[PDB]
């Protein structure tokens, strides 16, 4: 059983992001991780780690799920 | 001359071998979804029909 080791990006997520504040999703392969979603913002080129919870990114993610 | 990022598309991608999707949707591309792999650091543009690519989506929205 070799386990493998990998840490989660994420610890803490932005809940006040709207769909056009974003630049690109990234969606790290990090299963193991409660937080998977970072967003890079426009303007500024930050990146943060969003709430999974916001309606606009399904919607975002439109064919690869609806 | 803005153009889209993906032309051409790969639909053989193990999920073992990428790092993370980069995921864009803008209104004159649509939605484009480029992996980054881990064996060489490459950046691909991927079928979004893959397989285990709604999994992994929606692994991610929980």
Do not use: G, M
């Not at 392969?29 to 999974?52: E, F, S, Y």
């Amino acid at each position: 059983p070799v386990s493998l080791s990998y840490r989660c990006p994420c610890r803490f997520f932005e809940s006040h992001v709207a769909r056009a504040n974003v630049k690109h999703l990234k969606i790290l392969n990090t299963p193991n991780c409660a937080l998977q979603i970072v967003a890079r913002l426009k303007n500024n080129n930050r990146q943060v780690c969003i709430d999974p919870k916001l309606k606009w990114i399904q919607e975002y993610l439109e064919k690869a799920l609806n």
